[PDB]
Amino acid sequence: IISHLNWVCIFLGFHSFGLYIHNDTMRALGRPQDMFSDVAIQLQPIFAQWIQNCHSIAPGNTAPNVLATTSYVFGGDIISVGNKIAIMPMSLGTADFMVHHIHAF
Amino acid sequence: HERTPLANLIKWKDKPVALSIVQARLVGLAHFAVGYILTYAPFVIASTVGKF
Amino acid sequence: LGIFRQAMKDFASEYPDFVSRGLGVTSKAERWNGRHAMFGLLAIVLTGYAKGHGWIPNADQVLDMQQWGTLVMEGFNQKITNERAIVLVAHIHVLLVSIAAAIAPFSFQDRLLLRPGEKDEEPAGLLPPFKLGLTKEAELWNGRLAMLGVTFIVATSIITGQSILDVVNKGLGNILY
Amino acid sequence: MINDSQIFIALILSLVPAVLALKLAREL
Amino acid sequence: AIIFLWTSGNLFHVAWQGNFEKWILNPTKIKPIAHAIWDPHFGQAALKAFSQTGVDYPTNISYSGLYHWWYTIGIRTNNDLYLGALFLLVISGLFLFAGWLHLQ
Amino acid sequence: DFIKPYNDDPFVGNLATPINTSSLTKNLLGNLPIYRRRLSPLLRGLEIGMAHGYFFIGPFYKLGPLRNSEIALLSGFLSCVGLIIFLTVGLLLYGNTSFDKDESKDQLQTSEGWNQFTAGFLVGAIGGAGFAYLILVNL
Amino acid sequence: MTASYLPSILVPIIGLVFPFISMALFFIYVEQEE
Amino acid sequence: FQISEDTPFDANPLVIIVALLGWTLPASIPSNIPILHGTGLTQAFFTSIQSNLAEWPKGPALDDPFWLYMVLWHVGLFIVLFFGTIGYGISKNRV
Amino acid sequence: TLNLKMPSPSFGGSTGGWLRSAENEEKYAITWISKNEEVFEMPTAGAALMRSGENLLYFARKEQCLSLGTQLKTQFKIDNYKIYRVFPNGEIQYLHPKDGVFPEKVNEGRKAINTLTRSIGKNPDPVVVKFINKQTFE
Amino acid sequence: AHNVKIYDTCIGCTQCVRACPCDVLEMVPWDGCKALQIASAPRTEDCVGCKRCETACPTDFLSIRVYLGAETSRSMGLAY
Ligand code: CLA
Ligand code: CLA
Ligand SMILES: CCCCCCCCCCCCCCCC(=O)OC[C@H](COP(=O)(O)OC[C@@H](O)CO)OC(=O)CCCCCCCCCCCCCCC
Ligand SMILES: CC1=C(/C=C/C(C)=C/C=C/C(C)=C/C=C/C=C(C)/C=C/C=C(C)/C=C/C2=C(C)C[C@@H](O)CC2(C)C)C(C)(C)C[C@H](O)C1
Ligand SMILES: CC1=C(/C=C/C(C)=C/C=C/C(C)=C/C=C/C=C(C)/C=C/C=C(C)/C=C/C2=C(C)C[C@@H](O)CC2(C)C)C(C)(C)C[C@H](O)C1
Ligand SMILES: CC1=C(/C=C/C(C)=C/C=C/C(C)=C/C=C/C=C(C)/C=C/C=C(C)/C=C/C2=C(C)CCCC2(C)C)C(C)(C)CCC1
Ligand code: SF4
């Protein structure tokens, strides 16, 4: 148990924090095109993006008697009170992929 | 290592052990001191170059 | 011989591990370096001829950093020429042969290092035995002469300030170019 | 200013400390 | 010997890759060069950023004060620096030899 | 039931599980070049080299600093050769320190045996990298 | 041959060859049983 | 086949067949929700397979109903397979 | 003598047991006699079932054997256990209790090893043993 | 191996012997104290240097002393 957990921690450490170090090095060296980013080498969280889509289309479908999304975080309208944003969709990109693997680590 | 196929073909000559009690203190102090100098040196240099 | 024989023993005492594997002041290393020097002088001659007769295409053209990357750059914001890159590639071919030969030799060929308990070949001396043909003697004769040639040609270039190719070309009587 | 000849003289001369360093290292 | 090789290297790199001769003409404005950069990890944007010191190749600026020192004590040319570097190579070798000798 | 003491010895530090002692596992491992019966060290090394050399070119080709250039694949190949040489030296160093006069009956666990294996790995690996280059340069 | 070529020849040797030869030699030294 | 050291295991493929039929039949009962049209999950999935194979090289997009059908269909198949294997194991006196 | 054919406690096995070094350096054996079948804790972790009668276990370290010995004595009132060192070549050294009697009980025949005829405060200064092989505590 | 020494202030209480998890120590006859016994260290090749013996010793200062020395597989407590 402990040997495998040890390994998964080393794997996660390298392939999460290591990506930030790659990026720092590439940007310092003037090579933004070699970075892990939305505008270079992309790491899209496609599974999370797909779940967001399921939740946004669920009302009147897989949840037929629900009128609106559980949360606007998944997609849909910008809700505002006063002129302040209450809640709106949270896009997930490379920066979101990277920090999620830090949490896993 | 000893129970992994393929890998357990390869054998260490020196038994791996954790660093000694004194060695840890020394290695910790070395990192602390090197880090201290390599943080301050860029700051003191770039601060002044940046301003003047 | 007494000066040389003693010098070999001194080196063997200082470096037993290296001398036992035929590295350093050995007959093993003498011969191997002789072979490379002989090939080397041919390569220099072929370079002088290929340059003269225009075999290398776009010799003086500089390589692009976009295509070939950062390694094209030299010290003082200079770029490597096509000629130089090409000559390097020629050497990479025979370097990879060398690595294969060293690590994975033919069963019959001469090996790079001495075996666990192999003695060295006896030193040839001031003059080896003069045996015409494909002999160890004739190889050592031509190997020693080649390595002398490389030493001389290099030394001449720095002292006189002429190019090695110019020295070689004038040495052959302006035949190559 | 400094020539190729001058840089090669330096490199050749740097072999003297190199060889001597080797000798001292071994003797220690 | 190590101290003298280190000093030799400082002299040699400034003689070869520095801008001492240009710097002495305007010491309060020109930045003194430590040595050249050769690093194939650099992208083109970083090459440009480090090539802003008058010369046409990337360099590090010196903060050691060597240019100021050498100028004060009478050095004026790269040939002065170069001969200095050569001299200290010889002194290094001498100490190295004395080290060996005094173990015989 | 399914998990048992390893080699019928409960005080050895291992368990027999499906992952390590199933028929599928024993079939796979037994036939890998490093374990397979009636192979010379050279041939073991050659097969291993080929398999590894072939896959090494992919990362360098597609993700290296020259991935977007016309010479991406050649850069990929040179990178493999570089990697292969380092690995070979690793193998040389391992054999040199690990084996001596002990002529064990395994063969491979010997100075001579390990040198044949290393020779195999090098030639196999450059070959496999070479073969991958030829497929990719066409396709 | 010129001097501006020197960094491109030397830096790879001091950085990728000299260290790995040194590491290899030190490794052999410390594992010798003698 | 031995699942471990000296432990023969049955691995009867009837389990897979019974499981597949056991899931595919009730999963083909039609539904009224818009994503399943007027058909069941089985039909919806099989139709999406055909429609996506019609564009052989191009894979299904994120937002294609295919993905939801595939996952839902496999969740049900795997649950039946799982309990089916355990059921067969009980019958064979694995316990 | 040991007796290699002596039966072992019942145990399903663990990953905590001995590794390569036990095979080609040295291993330890502990034997004992129990009156009844009984569950005890393996020093390598897990519950094992003591046979009634003779019991043989092998471990990688002497401390593992002695740890079990202490458990036998404290928990089960078994004081008849014996510990051996077993070499790869087949040789066997009897270790404990060395002379039949436990070390905590005085026994005539034993000779004082590593005793000194002074208090600890009468050791010489390090400077006095400088450039000789002596230690201050010799 | 570690060095273990017993000094003549020992009062023959046996606590060090009882504390030792590697059976390095034993009690031997002696005239020097009321208990008519002294601690002894005949098996220091098995000493791991844990210093449980010193923790157990009631005298001031200690009558048993462990000087950590040349490490072995035994002394480092390796089961691999
Ligand atoms: C740790 C994570 C990490 C990752 C994923 C990357 C990834 C990358 N780096 Mg970065 N880098 C990192 C950390 C990382 N880096 C750090 C910490 C630094 C130090 C500052 C750098 C500094 C750096 C530089 C200077 C450069 C890169 C470059 C690159 C790119 C090419 C590297 C290459 O060719 O490797 C070769 C890869 C392999 C030989 C194999 C990889 C491992 C395989 C795929 C594992 C397969 C296991 C398999 C699944 C097991 C299955 C077994 C069974 C089924 C048989 C690649 C995008 C280069 C680039 O150009 O960027 C665009 C480049 O020039 N990196
Ligand atoms: C200190 C000196 C040093 C030097 C000179 C280099 C040089 C290079 N590195 Mg860097 N690197 C270094 C240290 C160094 N590295 C260190 C310490 C790290 C860890 C942080 C890295 C991490 C790193 C990564 C992750 C990457 C590089 C890459 C590169 C190459 C990028 C330029 C290019 O486009 O080539 C393109 C590359 C080629 C055309 C292939 C050249 C391969 C050569 C010919 C092989 C030679 C092997 C050698 C002779 C074997 C014998 C040595 C020893 C066993 C005796 C360049 C060759 C990139 C690369 O492309 O590597 C493959 C890359 O992805 N480096
Ligand atoms: C202890 C040795 C360690 C070796 C480390 C290797 C890395 C250093 C390589 C530096 C090369 C660049 C500087 C020379 C550059 C230089 O001065 O070039 C001089 C000369 C230049 O000739 P050209 O015709 O190009 O130009 C001449 C004129 O135009 C300029 O004067 O070129 C050569 O001789 C090439 C072959 C040099 C071979 C060098 C020796 C290689 C083998 C090692 C032997 C050294 C030990 C000596 C005795 C113990
Ligand atoms: C050309 C080139 C290539 C060939 C390269 C090749 C291998 C180059 C070989 C050059 C040789 C090795 C020079 C050797 C010159 C050796 C000198 C001349 C020795 C002086 C010894 C003294 C005389 C000893 C003094 C002694 C001392 C120490 C101690 C006392 O005992 C007294 C004595 C006993 C006298 C390629 C292959 C790379 C391709 C490229 O394309 C072109
Ligand atoms: C006055 C003299 C001086 C020196 C005199 C002078 C300069 C001596 C130098 C001689 C020369 C330049 C070298 C000649 C030797 C070169 C030959 C021997 C090369 C053979 C090539 C091979 C054998 C064929 C290649 C092959 C061919 C067939 C084709 C390829 O495909 C394969 C290979 C297998 C590589 C002093 C001042 C130093 C002092 C000294 O006191 C006396
Ligand atoms: C995904 C998957 C998986 C896995 C996979 C893998 C892991 C693979 C691999 C593979 C591989 C990795 C392969 C390779 C191959 C190779 C080859 C095919 C090679 C070849 C070669 C050649 C042909 C040649 C050679 C040579 C030359 C060129 C010349 C000289 C030298 C020599 C002779 C060597 C599994 C099954 C689990 C499951 C399912 C899925
Ligand atoms: S240090 Fe530990 S093992 Fe050594 S004698 Fe004292 S109690 Fe026993």
XYZ file of C-alpha atoms in Angstrom, chain C residues 149-161 164:
14
model
C 52.456 14.400 -39.577
C 49.394 15.682 -37.689
C 51.629 17.099 -34.927
C 53.824 18.867 -37.507
C 50.966 20.204 -39.657
C 49.098 21.589 -36.617
C 52.285 23.069 -35.106
C 53.173 24.659 -38.472
C 49.774 26.391 -38.749
C 49.948 28.202 -35.385
C 53.630 29.137 -35.717
C 53.372 30.430 -39.311
C 49.732 31.598 -39.111
C 46.125 23.590 -41.991
